[PDB]
Structures are given as structure tokens and as C-alpha cells.
């Protein structure tokens, strides 16, 4: 898909 | 042609490896402390599965897993990566003075040519809901380079599913589709597409985290053992379930998460994305029913979650769920590649 | 095969028209009140430009624009859409009982065949920074069906450039890239990639909004007249600029927005995505400078913004700028297809040092 | 002996300049975007007050204000700093290739020897409640190096005060002191120190931010003009007030904040720490009454806030407040050097 | 003049006893239930060690310990306190009607004059990491008033050392120092100070708590016996250590805590500030390694922790450590007087890779 | 690009 | 006082 | 140091 790994906040 | 290029249409692979070519995406994965710290713990605690061993790193990205394997004493590490990230992994190998031990090999693991067989394979082939990206097949495909007695890190993946109740999430998606219910949007009647809108919005798995209090039954588990499974095993994944409802209420869908276990010679270490554990960049995944099912505490919710692999490096999901005590049935089709990222 | 296939890699097209096949994207666009509101007014209020006319709707999506033309009295409407949204729009044509006036033609405008010439073409080919998606070329390409004296709705497009000061935005780039500047990230030295991290971040145009007071000089406007322009004019777009600074400070980049005008026989309606106007889903686009440029009020900032079309339906951006009083210059290369969506919903905060009277006095 | 060493006992100056010797404290000040961005705006917008001028930077710290003055075209900049931070400012001067223009001069501005008179002085001499640290006296003291026509950046400081109501804050501090009300803490009777505990806790100004809705009257303003004031003016600061109450309720104290204005030749720029403006590392300051005063919408709250400078580089605060319509009086003594930092 | 004046700069003393003059600090200490609870039990439960005895309370503060001794039956109690808390404690002595049994003596124990020798000394001279504040020397100095066979409450102190892995903590140091690594912070290049920023942060011991599973080997204990030690023994404290690693990983530093034992005639009461025990206001102290050290389970980590007393009532810390199987070594210099209080109230999270069974299975 | 048209909050 | 300038969160 | 004894939350 478009973004395989999702942004995770730090 | 290669095993990869057949099961993947070009347009999916282009966008796919384009995404992993960006350092910002490596930063996001690597900054996942639970993810990255757990791999390192697993590898160093079982250093004897690496000490003076030959290692294969499938999809090494920036190479962080190859550095852990070197830290564990590996004799040689072939780090395979098909995105442009491979050139950046080379730079870190040189600057960390590990050029004698880590050998970056750019290309798809289904296509590259390794110089020798390896004792252990390492990789992070897990997508959200575990099976997205279809990278587990690349992981299993790499076993052709694995010695008879060789090991796999991770060794197994346990995907869990449990019915949930979440009226706030159901109505949110439901009202979105109801935009197309309007009879006079700027004078235009959109109602004829209402059914198409609802099917589309509910075709999307929801990616975010949830309190466990919304789960209505113990989770059902389906285990893929990476040591024994072969590629084709993952083309069609059939997961029968039979949930014993612990609470009455509307079942709005099935919630998914996964664990993986690094079964080393010294200890077994788990990396879990459960809703009870600290959050990871994988979150959890919920597949909504277009129409929820009512169940009573004590009923049995039975059905089958079927995952059919597609050329877009993802899966077509089929979830049929049935309250046995009333015959209330729910059939659903979802597209894992087109999720809705709801977390905020 | 076709003009569209020559200039577009198949993989870019696939991803592109797959995006526009989702009703959720149409919905997002239709729920842009400024967008849909302005297009409706520009059509029904110029009713003489549509009444009993032949219309071409390029990239019609759900057909909304083609219904406005019908609402304006158009005789026949050829609605072209390449994405699979074409079949949803046919449904809307049937359900609205307009099969005699609106004809959906599934396919790319460069490849379909119309049975007649049209008096007016309508479309929404504006991407962010106007030029993204390279659909303007499809809009000009469609003029092979426009009679002489026909009209184009929109008729012109004004892209606006202005230098901005935003230190927070600039510093954010190094704060993020500095992740890689540690000698022992889990026992690894990542510092060798810090420079590549910076570069990657500066190549991304920033898509969000901002307070007008970050601008340091009046805007410069480059105008595309859709009635005269030809496709090839957009393969290479050179935008010279000579800004006269009205505010002293550090120039961190150039800000972009655009406007379009539906120049009808009855009136001219403007659709403007400027930071002075209510927000649209195009937002605004800012292009940072790798190195910022000191300028004082009265200096001139001069240079060129050059956009080179690529086979990913977008543009390679090159921005060169210098302060003429010092010779200090700055270059930058950005990829318009890979922006960083920065918007957070918060109202843009005013830049510091902007109070000329005591905030306490009138609080 | 110098003007500084007389009005400052050594033990206060040691701890004082020790604090500013740490880079972590410079990072905190410099990262205050409103603070640092506003100085830069003020200086560059009025570049002609610097272009080819001679500048004095009082307490330059890392030197950031001297870099702004150089950016504005200053011919020479004497950057004075008495903490060990001066050695770090030198390093930045060298690495930014401004050694021909910025001259770091370590020591206390009351003691160092500048080579010549300056056209403009720049500095950040503002403490919380403006007057803490007693650095404004160092700022005014530096005017001995200022040319007749010279300017001061900032030029003036407006300290504002307004009565407030905040029962949550009053009870919080009040109950803390009531610990010493216990008659049998581990069998020990502490009650005899109750009065001492309350006096101590309410001797502390409260440092944090507050919604303006709690202010019960328009603010009263007291302006220190840095161009005309001399050092001794700030030894005793008497601020008469007469507030017209706009709301009925308990007056729990006086809230303080401040603005400063850079009155340049091109424009005037304000740096404000008001509760209506974005937050800064100065926050706001509230002095609580041991016993609040009840006022009706329309009464007049009159009194005097007196600030007496002490050897600890701070002020002894005296606030006497009186509701004229009832004669309800409140007398208070507070120690600016010992605040309670409440923000979270 | 006095032993205290010789080893303490006046400015350090001023700031020091000004701190202890505030009832809010006494309150904070007294409300430490473990602290006050354990001291009370150790005194009243060893009642024979106080009944009809002569007592010295060194640094009595509010006098709380001197009341416990009174509650235990002590005949006369000399309560010494240098801060201005002495006058508050006299008030409590009057208000509690104990002027005949508790005598407050304002002044430093090294300078006051007692009218007789005591049978037992009580005090709370433990700082964080035990040794901070250099009050243990005042506690041993006070033995000039203790009869032969007298007792000391506390009697001994055990400081514990253990290596820890905490990558998050280590990386935080560079994340904060990397502020200075930007070429244009408001148009200034700050990078030349980044190294000095790192150094400054690593010199700070970290005061907070942590989960026991960050420790990689059993603790090593260095014991000060207050009945035998002399002042001068604490000017230079060398703590040799040879840790046997039980966990493979990166050693980022050494963790510190301490215990004290009130060895009474009737029982021995322990006050322990260990991460296994409920939190006290001493927390725990961790000293990072500038460079971390790779170790596997079965290796030995060896070295020395050397504490050098300074004139700021604290200690200069030097930690040298090496993995003997590799020769990889690491040094560090920290200032115990300038810790970084990191505690946030959140329960310490368990280190990753610590689940040996599926978290999902038993959830 | 990945999202030719950006989401506008309703 | 102890800390003339207060910690400001970023 | 500045705060010899650290604040413990009640
Ligand atoms: C979830 C992480 C994926 C990483 O592995 C790389 N990758 C995916 N698929 C392949 C194949 N077939 N060969 C080599 N590397 C692969 C991704 O690029 C990403 O770094
Ligand atoms: C910004 C709106 C785009 C809409 O127009 C469609 N579209 C793009 N490019 C073409 C071509 N070449 N022919 C027909 N339709 C086109 C998009 O699918 C979208 O609906
Ligand atoms: C609030 C900022 C204070 C800065 O100025 C320095 N500073 C204070 N007082 C003096 C004197 N008398 N001479 C020179 N520098 C001074 C502080 O060290 C801090 O950087
Ligand atoms: C940790 C507790 C300290 C208490 O003891 C007092 N104190 C410290 N140092 C001395 C000396 N040398 N003589 C008498 N009292 C001392 C502190 O003031 C605090 O109350």
C-alpha cells in the first residue's frame, strides 16, 4: 500500500 | 523473471521500494524503541546463535539488524536490501569499520546471489496485521540459503484476533459514507452511490490502538512457524475461529495484533504488539462489519477469516462471522493495502 | 501510443488514477466549500456561457461540475474521466435522469474520441502549487475539441511567489535530521548519514498554511493563460523574480499559492488559494532554502524558480536566489511529488517581533 | 570593591554565575522562540541603529545578541559576560568567523574596562517579575559607556499588575502549610509552627501561567525607562495602585507580568510576557495574600507594592492591599528570590 | 577555626544551610513515610538503647528524631542543628513540654560544646548516593562526644553498585546536546559547542528510579561502619568492583543505592533505598558511561569507582570500567553536586526484550 | 505523488 | 535565587 | 548542591 509502515510519534 | 516479480506487479513494487528508500522512514522504524530494543535484546541474549556464525539479513534497510548480529560476534553477515537504502547501509558499514564483516548486497532476496549458505536468518518481515507487504514470503523464500540446522530470527509469528465493540468507531465510519446519502448536494442527488460509499469505507481496516476493555472474547491464535512454513503456504491463509462471548453487546468487528518469538539457544524473547503492551509503529488493526452482530454473554461467535494474497503485496481479507445462537451472519471484504490510519 | 502514455510512467499513472478511484477522495474534494462553492457560482452565474452550449468536462470525477453545467442549461456534456470514478458518475447521471444531456466517457482525455466540438471546456486541473499532477497539460490538450472562440473554465491561472521568514520551520529540518547524529544508537554510529538526512528533508516542499506576516515582500505573479498556452509550454516553467524586501531578516524560502479566474461573458469569478483567503484543500506550498539569506528592508532578492516536468506527473523544482546588495546566494532542489504535509489544524501563530504596540495595553 | 560586589554578597554571586555557566541553561533561554525571535526581529528591523555602530552587550551569555547585532551590520561589539559562559561565546565567535567584529570581554560589567564608548547597549536584563536578579542595575550601570545620543535595547520595561481570583491556588498552598497544624504527627504536636509554615509558603511568589479570566480588574502599569533611570532608582521601587473592581469575588493576590519595548529609529517592537500572549520562560508571577479580600464589582482596591532590593540579587516584596468600601486590609511580605515554580 | 570551616567553602555552606532553614524541606523529609517510619521503629523498638540514656541528635532539623528518643525514654537529649531550623525545633520542644529532656543547641556539630558525653548518637546524615552533602563526616566527627561502648543510630551504611542497560537514557544525552548541532540557529552556527554540551550532560548523575530488570549483574556492596570509620576515611572513597554479567548487552553505566542498619540491643532495623523497595526521597542514582561497553552473559566487568571529596560538600566522581574478555574500557567524570533530577512520577517501564513468554497468551 | 489532493478537515 | 531562569518546555 | 534532598511526591 501507500505507506507500509505507519508514522509513530516519539 | 523471479519469484518476486511474478507475485508482484511492477507498479506495486516501484511505490513499495520507493517508500523504503527514504531515511525518514528508517528513522521512524528505528525510533520505535520497543521494536528496535527488542530485536537487539533477542540477538545479544542469544549471542551464541551468532558468535562466529554466517548471517543473512533479509531487507536490512539501514542495516541495524546486521550491526546487532556483528555485536553478537557474527563471522560474516550478508545484508540484503532492494530499496535505495542499501547505499546508506554501505555508508554506515564503512563509518563503523565493519567492512570486514557486513556485506551489503543490493537487490531483492528472490533475485540476488549469495556466496554461501547461512546458519541463521534475521529480518523484520512483519507488516501491520503481520501479513501486509507479503514480506514473510521473501523471508521464507530466503531459507534456500539456510543450512539444515539453521535458525530463523524471528522463528514464529502468532497473529491474534478477538471480537470487539466500539460504537464510536462504527458511527464515525458510517456517517462518513452517509455523505453520499444526501439527495441534493449543491442540488445534486448523490444517494445512488450510498451503497458504494459504505462498501468502500468499510473495506478499509482501521489502524490505531484501543483499550482492551472493548474486547468481548478471548483472542484466537493462528501461528505461522517460519522454520517449517514454505512460501506458497502464505498465498491463502484460512483462520477458523469460534469465540465464546464473555460480554453482551454489539460486535462491531474483529481486532488483530501479533507477536513474534525469537527462539534462540539461550532464551526465547517475544516482541508483542498487543494492546496491553507499549505502543509500536504497527499499532493494531480492526476490521469493521458493515452491520454489527448482537451477541449475549455465553453465545458462540464462529466463522472464518480468509486472507488471499494479491499482486499489490498485500491481502484481500474475507471475514464471515456468525452468532450461532441466532444465525445472525456478517460477510465482509477488506483490502489490507488500503487501511485507514486513525491514530492521533 | 498517446500523448499521456509518452510523458507518464505507467507506475505513476497506476498509483495516480487508483487514488482518484476512491469516493472518499471525491468526498474530500467536494466538501471543500470554497472549491465547490466557487465552481458552482462561476458556472450558474455565467449561465449564458452554458445555456444550450456543448460542454467538455475534463477529469470530471463524480461529475459534479457536469451537473452545474446542466443546471446552467447546457445541451450536451461530454464528461471525461480516466479513473474508475467514471462508472460512479454514470450512476449519478442515471439516478439524476440526465442521460440525455451528460455523457460519461471512461478514459484519458488524450485517448478518448468525442463526436463533436465543444463551445466551452470545464475542468479542475489545479494541483498544489498549481502545477503538480501535470493535469494542466491535459487541460490544454483538450483544446483540440474546442471550437474557435470557445471558452475555458478556468481561463487563466496566477501562481504567486513571495519570500518568507520562518526560523522554526527551518530549524525543524535539522532537529529531525539530527536523529542520525549520535555515536551510539544501540551501539551504532549513525552520524555518517546526517548530511543525507538534512538533504532529504530540504528536498520536500512544505504543504501547510501560515500567517501572512511571515512574508517579507509583495508577491510576484506568473500567469498561465489557458486559452493561449500550449502543452509544451508547461514542460519547462521559468519564473523570474525580483523581490523588493519590505522587512529585514533571514529569508528561509519562497511561499507559493495560486488563483484561477472563470472569465465568463457575464462576470469574472475568482478562486484564490491565498493565505489571505479561507483555507482550501490546496493549502499553500513553501520551498525552503538550504542556506537562508540575510536581507534588510530596501534590499532586492532576485533569482529564478525553474520547474522541470518529470515522468512522475510532477515537477523537479530548482530555486536560485541572491540578495543583490551582498551577493549572498542560495540554491535548492525539491521534488514537488514528495511534499511534507505539515498542517496540524492549529491557527498559524504570528511571527515574533510583530507587535508594534504593547500587547498588555490593549489586552 | 566595585558597584556590583557591594550590593551583592559573595555567596549569592557564586551560585548566581555558576547557574549561567551551564550550556543547558543557555539552551533553555535560546530555545524560547518568542524571546529569541523577538530580539532578532527588533534588532534587524532597526538595523540602522546598528549598521557601522559600536555595541555593548551586557551579559551576552553564549553571545546570541551579539550575533544579531553583527547581522545588523555593527562595526564592533563588546560582549560582556561574567559567568564561565564567556569562554563558550568566544568559541562561537571563532567558528562563525566574527573575530574581527565581536570582542568577548569576561567579567562583571561593573568591573571590566571597555576600550571606548558605544552607540547602543543591548542586553536581556529581565528576570521573572522583571526585577529579579537585579540585573537592570547592571544594565543602567553600563550607561557610563553610552554616548550622549546613544540608545538602549530594550529602551523601557512596563511591569503590569492586576488583582486575581484563584481559590484552587490558594487552597493548594494553604493546605500545604496545614501539615504543621497536625497535633500528633508520629505522636509529635507540630501545631505551634502553623503560623510559621503559613508565613513561609505565602512568602513565595508563584511562578506559572494563568487564564486571564481570573483577573478582576484592569492592570496597573509601572514603567522603568532605561534611557533616563539610574542605578539607585531601582533600590526601592514604590508602585501605588488603585484598582476598579470589575467582578465580585475573593481577591487572592496580585498577578504580575511585564513587557519591554525596543524603541528603534525605524520601528518599535514589543516583547510581552502577558498571559494573553504565547508562553515564555518568564511565565507570570502571582503573589498570594495570606487571607484574601472580598470585593464587589465597582469597589476600589488600593494599596502599594513596594520592592526593596537585597544583597541576594533579588527583592523583598511588600504588598499592602485594601478594599476601600469596607476597610478590609491585607499586608504581605514576599521574597522574590524564593519562588514556587508551579507550572506543569 | 573549625573542622567544618576548613573543608567547606563559605558560599557552599550558606546555600546549604539556607536550604535546610525552610519548613517546606523538613515537611518533604518528614512526609517520607519509609524514612520517618523506619527511623521511628528503629528507635522505639530498641527502647533499651534509649531508656534513661544520654542522646546526641546531629543535624536534628525540626527535632523529630529527638522526640522519638524522648518517646523511647531518654533522660537528656542534645539536639544539634546548624540551619535556622534550630529555632523552630526549640518551639516544638516548648510546645511539647520537653524542655527538661530535649536541649536544642543552634550551631554546627563541629563547633558547639556539649556539657557531657552521650551513650548513643542519632542522625540522618545520608545524602543521595549516601555520600552527598559530606554530612557523614559530621556524623563521625560527633563521636568525640560518644562514650566507649556507645552506639550509633544508624550504625553502618551499605552502598550498592550495579551495571545497567538503558539505551533511552543514554541516547537522551545526545538528543539534548544536538540542539547545538545546527549551522543556522537564527543565522548562527552553534555546532562548535555540541561536544561541550555532551560533556556537560554526562557529568551529571541521574537522580530517578528504574525497573530492576535494567541491571545486568548482582550488586557489589561497599560498607561504611560508622562505629569504626573516621572522618578522613571519607575524603577519598575507592570502591573496587568486579561484576559478573548475567545479561548480554550494552552497559551504559553503574546504578547506586544504599541501606543503613540501626543495630540495636533488641533488634536490627534496616532502612533501604533500593529499587526493589518502596521509593524514598533519595530515589536512586545512576552514573552514565561516556562510551558504553558491550558485554555478554558470563563476561566480567571490572574497574573502580573513586569519590574525591570537594569543598562544595559533595564528591567528584571518577568511574573506570572495562570488560575483561575484550579490553574495551570506559571512563567518566561526574559532579555529584549537580545531578539531573529525571523522575517524572511514571512507574518505570520494563526494558524491552524482557518477555520470555507471549504477552498475548496471558493477557 | 502519493496523495495528489490533500485532506481538508471538515 | 536558586534558578533565576525557569525551565521552559519545547 | 542546589537541592540536597529531593522532593518526594505525596
Ligand atoms: C518491513 C521491512 C521491510 C524492509 O525489507 C525490504 N524488503 C522488502 N522486500 C524485500 C525483498 N524482496 N528483498 C529485499 N529486501 C526487501 C524493504 O525495502 C524494507 O527495507
Ligand atoms: C485534480 C483532478 C483530477 C481529476 O481529473 C482526472 N484526470 C487526470 N488526468 C486525466 C486525464 N489525462 N484524462 C482524464 N481525466 C484525468 C483524475 O482522475 C481526477 O478525477
Ligand atoms: C538574565 C540574563 C543574565 C545574563 O547576564 C549575565 N550577567 C548578569 N549580571 C552580570 C554582570 N554584572 N556583568 C556581566 N554579565 C552579567 C549572566 O551571567 C547571564 O548570562
Ligand atoms: C540530611 C540532613 C541534614 C540535616 O543536618 C543538618 N546539618 C548538616 N550538617 C551539619 C553540621 N555540620 N552540624 C549540624 N547540623 C548539620 C542540616 O542543616 C539538616 O538539618
| Domains of chain C, first to last | 3-157 (3.40.50.150), 158-341 (2.70.160.11)
Resolution (A): 2.2
Are the CB atoms for C324 and C299 separated by under 8 Å?
yes
Distance between alpha carbon B77 and the CA centroid of its chain, in Å? 25
Residue C47 buriedness (CB in 10 A; 0-12 / 13-18 / 19+): middle
Three-state DSSP state, C186: coil
* Residue C329 CB-half CA count within 13 A: 9
Cis peptide upstream of residue C316 (ω within 30 degrees of 0): no
Q: What is the rounded distance in angstroms from the CA atom of residue E217 to the CA atom of residue E163? A: 7
**In whole angstroms, how far apart are CA E294 and each of A10, B54, D35, E323, E332?**
26, 20, 43, 8, 16
Ligand whose nearest atom lies closest to the CA of D108 = 3
Supply φ then ψ for residue B86, to 5 degrees.
Answer: -60, -40
Q: What is the DSSP string of D187-231?
A: TB--GGGHHHHHHHHHTSPEEE---GGGB-SPPEEEEEETTT--G
Tell me if residue B6 is catalytic: no
Centroid of ligand 4 to alpha carbon of D335 (angstroms): 24
Centroid of ligand 2 to alpha carbon of D149 (angstroms): 67
Are the CB atoms for D78 and D57 separated by under 8 Å?
yes
Cβ of B67 within 8 Å of Cβ of C187? The answer is yes
| C280 in F contact zone (CB under 8 Å) | yes
Residues of E in contact with B160 (CB under 8 A): 360
Q: What is the rounded distance in angstroms from the CA atom of residue D256 to the CA atom of residue D164? A: 10
Strands of the C236-244 sheet, one edge to the other: C236-244, C300-309, C315-323, C329-335
**Mutation target vs D (from E29, E186, E339; most D CBs, 10 A cutoff):** E186
> Which of B4, B58, B60, B258 to mutate for ligand 1's pocket (most ligand atoms within 8 Å of CB)?
B58
Annotated catalytic residue, options E49, E133, E158, E208: E133
Nearest CA in chain D to G10: D31
Distance between alpha carbon C334 and the CA centroid of its chain, in Å? 15
E138 annotated as ligand-binding: yes
**In whole angstroms, how far apart are CA C7 and each of C110, C136, C306?**
11, 13, 19
Q: Nearest CA to CA, how far is A10 from chain F (Å)?
A: 24
B161-174 exposure pattern, b = at least 16 Cβ within 10 A, e = fewer? bbbbbbeebbeebb
| E204 in H contact zone (CB under 8 Å) | no
| D278 in C contact zone (CB under 8 Å) | yes
**In whole angstroms, how far apart are CA C165 and each of C182, C248, C295, C328, E84?**
30, 10, 10, 16, 55
Three-state DSSP state, B55: strand
Q: Which three cell numbers stand for residue D87?
A: 569562554
Closest CA to E36 of E46, E23, E26: E26
- A→B contacts (Cβ < 8 Å), by residue, are 1-8, 10
Closest CA to E183 of D65, D69, C170, C353: C170
Which residues does a chain break follow in chain H (C to N more than 2.5 Å)? none
> Which residue's alpha carbon is at the smallest distance from atom 8 of ligand 3?
D59
G1-10 exposure pattern, b = at least 16 Cβ within 10 A, e = fewer? beebbbebee
| D274 in C contact zone (CB under 8 Å) | yes
| E98 in H contact zone (CB under 8 Å) | no
Q: How far apart are the first and last CA of chain H?
A: 23
Cβ of D95 within 8 Å of Cβ of E191? The answer is yes
Q: To 5 degrees, how large is the angle CA B147–CA B151–CA B153?
A: 135
Residues of G in contact with H3 (CB under 8 A): 2
Q: Do chains E and C touch (3 or more CB pairs under 8 A)?
A: yes
Centroid of ligand 2 to alpha carbon of C136 (angstroms): 10
**Mutation target vs D (from E12, E190, E191, E344; most D CBs, 10 A cutoff):** E190
Centroid of ligand 1 to alpha carbon of B108 (angstroms): 7
Are the CB atoms for E178 and E237 separated by under 8 Å?
no
Q: What is the rounded distance in angstroms from the CA atom of residue C89 to the CA atom of residue C75? A: 18
Three-state DSSP state, E338: coil
> Which residue's alpha carbon is at the smallest distance from atom 15 of ligand 1?
B59
Centroid of ligand 4 to alpha carbon of D312 (angstroms): 23
C286 annotated as ligand-binding: no
Helix axes D167-177, D194-202, angle to 10 degrees: 140
Annotated catalytic residue, options B49, B57, B90, B124: B124
Q: To 5 degrees, how large is the angle CA C242–CA C243–CA C247?
A: 160
Paired with E118 in beta bridges are E146
Q: What is the DSSP letter of C70?
A: H
Is the CB–ligand 4 distance for residue E163 below 6 Å?
no
> Which of E20, E113, E121, E126 to mutate for ligand 4's pocket (most ligand atoms within 8 Å of CB)?
E20
| Proportion of chain C in helix, strand, coil states, percent, rounded to 5 | 30, 35, 40
Using a 6 Å CB cutoff, which residues line ligand 3? D 4, 17, 20, 59, 61, 80-83, 85, 108-110, 124, 133, 135, 138
Residues ≥6 apart with Cβ < 8 Å to B163: B215, B216, B217, B243, B245, B251, B253, B254, B255, B295, B301, B321
Is the CB–ligand 2 distance for residue C138 below 6 Å?
yes
**Quick one: which atom of ligand 4 is closest to the CA of E26?**
20
Are the CB atoms for D146 and D117 separated by under 8 Å?
yes
**Quick one: which atom of ligand 1 is closest to the CA of B141?**
12
Three-state DSSP state, E329: strand
Q: How far apart are the first and last CA of chain G?
A: 23
Q: Which three cell numbers stand for residue D325?
A: 468600601
Q: What is the rounded distance in angstroms from the CA atom of residue D63 to the CA atom of residue D69? A: 10
Distance between alpha carbon E319 and the CA centroid of its chain, in Å? 17
Are the CB atoms for B20 and B88 separated by under 8 Å?
no
Residue C134 buriedness (CB in 10 A; 0-12 / 13-18 / 19+): buried
Strand-strand pairing, E268-272 and E249-263: antiparallel
* Residue E312 CB-half CA count within 13 A: 16
Query: In B101-166, where does DSSP find H-type helix?
Result: 135-141
Are the CB atoms for B262 and B268 separated by under 8 Å?
yes
Strands of the E118-123 sheet, one edge to the other: E102-106, E76-81, E54-58, E118-123, E146-153
Contacts 24+ apart (CB under 8 A), C190-197: C190/B92, C191/B95, C192/B91, C192/B92, C192/B94, C192/B95, C193/B23, C193/B62, C193/B88, C193/B91, C193/B92, C196/B23, C196/B88, C196/B91, C197/B23, C197/B24, C197/B27
Q: What is the rounded distance in angstroms from the CA atom of residue D77 to the CA atom of residue D54? A: 6
Structural biology method used: X-ray
Q: What is the rounded distance in angstroms from the CA atom of residue E135 to the CA atom of residue H4? A: 11
Are the CB atoms for B37 and E353 separated by under 8 Å?
yes
Residues 27-66 in B contacting C (C-alpha not used; CB under 8 Å) = 27, 30-31, 36-37, 40, 62, 64
Residues of G in contact with H2 (CB under 8 A): 2-3
Tell me if residue E277 is catalytic: no
| B81 in E contact zone (CB under 8 Å) | no
Residues ≥6 apart with Cβ < 8 Å to E162: E215, E216, E217, E218, E219, E220, E243, E254, E255
Closest CA to E139 of E74, E199, E73, E58: E58
**In whole angstroms, how far apart are CA B24 and each of B344, C198, C201, C340?**
19, 10, 8, 11
Closest CA to B102 of B124, B69, B150, B72: B69
Q: What is the rounded distance in angstroms from the CA atom of residue B11 to the CA atom of residue B18? A: 11
Are the CB atoms for B160 and B219 separated by under 8 Å?
yes
| C167 in E contact zone (CB under 8 Å) | yes
Q: What is the rounded distance in angstroms from the CA atom of residue B119 to the CA atom of residue B73? A: 13
Centroid of ligand 2 to alpha carbon of B207 (angstroms): 29
Three-state DSSP state, C272: strand
Tally C–D CB contacts below 8 A: 69
Distance between alpha carbon D147 and the CA centroid of its chain, in Å? 26
Nearest CA in chain E to C289: E184
Q: What is the largest CA-CA distance in chain C?
A: 74
Q: Which three cell numbers stand for residue D218?
A: 484592569
> Which residue's alpha carbon is at the smallest distance from atom 17 of ligand 2?
C59
Sign of CA dihedral D139, D140, D143, D144: negative
Q: What is the DSSP letter of E68?
A: H
**In whole angstroms, how far apart are CA D222 and each of B86, D156, D229, D237?**
65, 10, 13, 10
Tell me if residue D32 is catalytic: yes
Query: Residue E177: in which H helix or E strand, if any?
Result: helix E167-177
Length of chain F: 10
Tell me if residue B124 is catalytic: yes
Centroid of ligand 4 to alpha carbon of C252 (angstroms): 57
Residues ≥6 apart with Cβ < 8 Å to D97: none
**Quick one: which atom of ligand 3 is closest to the CA of D20?**
18
**In whole angstroms, how far apart are CA C81 and each of C78, C88, C96, C125, D113?**
10, 11, 18, 12, 78
Q: Which three cell numbers stand for residue C315?
A: 515537477
Cβ of E187 within 8 Å of Cβ of C291? The answer is no
Closest CA to C103 of C158, C66, C151: C66
Query: In chain D, where does DSSP find H-type helix?
Result: 3-7, 10-19, 23-31, 33-45, 64-71, 85-95, 135-141, 167-177, 194-202
D24 annotated as ligand-binding: no
Q: What is the rounded distance in angstroms from the CA atom of residue C298 to the CA atom of residue D271? A: 25
Residues ≥6 apart with Cβ < 8 Å to B209: B275, B279, B283, B284, B343
Annotated catalytic residue, options D124, D137, D158, D259: D124
Q: To 5 degrees, how large is the angle CA B211–CA B216–CA B220?
A: 95
Closest CA to B119 of B59, B68, B48: B48
Q: What is the rounded distance in angstroms from the CA atom of residue D129 to the CA atom of residue D335? A: 12
Is the CB–ligand 4 distance for residue E130 below 6 Å?
no
Cβ of B19 within 8 Å of Cβ of A7? The answer is no
- Report the number of secondary-structure helices (H) and strands (E) in chain H: 0, 0
Residue B344 buriedness (CB in 10 A; 0-12 / 13-18 / 19+): exposed
Is the CB–ligand 1 distance for residue B136 below 6 Å?
no
Cβ of D30 within 8 Å of Cβ of E88? The answer is no
Query: Residue B124: in which H helix or E strand, if any?
Result: none
Is the CB–ligand 2 distance for residue C173 below 6 Å?
no
Q: To 5 degrees, how large is the angle CA D289–CA D293–CA D297?
A: 135
Q: To 5 degrees, how large is the angle CA B248–CA B254–CA B259?
A: 120
Are the CB atoms for E237 and E313 separated by under 8 Å?
no
Residues ≥6 apart with Cβ < 8 Å to D135: D58, D59, D123, D125, D126, D127, D313
Amino acid at each position: 500500500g501507500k505507506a507500509p509502515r505507519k508514522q509513530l510519534a516519539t | 523473471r523471479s519469484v518476486f516479480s511474478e507475485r508482484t506487479e511492477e507498479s506495486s513494487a516501484v511505490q513499495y521500494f520507493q517508500f523504503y528508500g527514504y531515511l525518514s522512514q528508517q528513522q521512524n522504524m528505528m525510533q520505535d524503541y520497543v521494536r528496535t530494543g527488542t530485536y537487539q535484546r533477542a540477538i545479544l541474549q542469544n549471542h551464541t546463535d551468532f558468535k562466529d556464525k554466517i548471517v543473512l539479513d533479509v531487507g536490512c534497510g539501514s542495516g541495524i539488524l546486521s550491526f546487532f548480529a556483528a555485536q553478537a560476534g557474527a563471522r560474516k553477515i550478508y545484508a540484503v536490501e532492494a530499496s535505495t537504502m542499501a547505499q546508506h547501509a554501505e555508508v554506515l558499514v564503512k563509518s563503523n569499520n565493519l567492512t570486514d564483516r557486513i556485506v551489503v548486497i543490493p537487490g531483492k532476496v528472490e533475485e540476488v546471489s549469495l556466496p554461501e549458505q547461512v546458519d541463521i536468518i534475521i529480518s523484520e518481515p512483519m507488516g501491520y496485521m503481520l501479513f501486509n507487504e507479503r514480506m514473510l514470503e521473501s523471508y521464507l523464500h530466503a531459507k534456500k540459503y539456510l543450512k539444515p540446522s539453521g535458525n530463523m530470527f524471528p522463528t514464529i509469528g502468532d497473529v491474534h484476533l478477538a471480537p470487539f465493540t466500539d460504537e464510536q468507531l462504527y458511527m464515525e465510519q458510517f456517517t462518513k459514507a452517509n455523505f453520499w446519502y444526501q439527495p441534493s448536494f449543491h442540488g445534486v442527488d448523490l444517494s445512488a452511490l450510498r451503497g458504494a460509499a459504505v462498501d468502500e469505507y468499510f473495506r478499509q481496516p482501521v489502524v490505531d490502538t484501543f483499550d482492551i476493555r472493548i474486547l468481548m472474547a478471548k483472542s484466537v491464535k493462528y501461528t505461522v512457524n517460519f522454520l517449517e512454513a514454505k512460501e506458497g503456504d502464505l498465498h491463502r491463509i484460512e483462520i477458523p475461529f469460534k469465540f465464546h462471548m464473555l460480554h453482551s453487546g454489539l460486535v462491531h468487528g474483529l481486532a488483530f495484533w501479533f507477536d513474534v518469538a525469537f527462539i534462540g539457544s539461550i532464551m526465547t524473547v517475544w516482541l508483542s504488539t498487543a494492546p496491553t503492551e507499549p505502543l509500536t509503529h504497527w499499532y493494531q488493526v480492526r476490521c469493521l462489519f458493515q452491520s454489527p452482530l448482537f451477541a449475549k454473554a455465553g453465545d458462540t461467535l464462529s466463522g472464518t477469516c480468509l486472507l488471499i494474497a494479491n499482486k499489490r503485496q498485500s491481502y484481500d481479507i474475507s471475514i464471515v462471522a456468525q452468532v450461532d445462537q441466532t444465525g445472525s451472519k456478517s460477510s465482509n471484504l477488506l483490502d489490507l493495502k488500503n487501511p485507514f490510519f486513525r491514530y492521533t
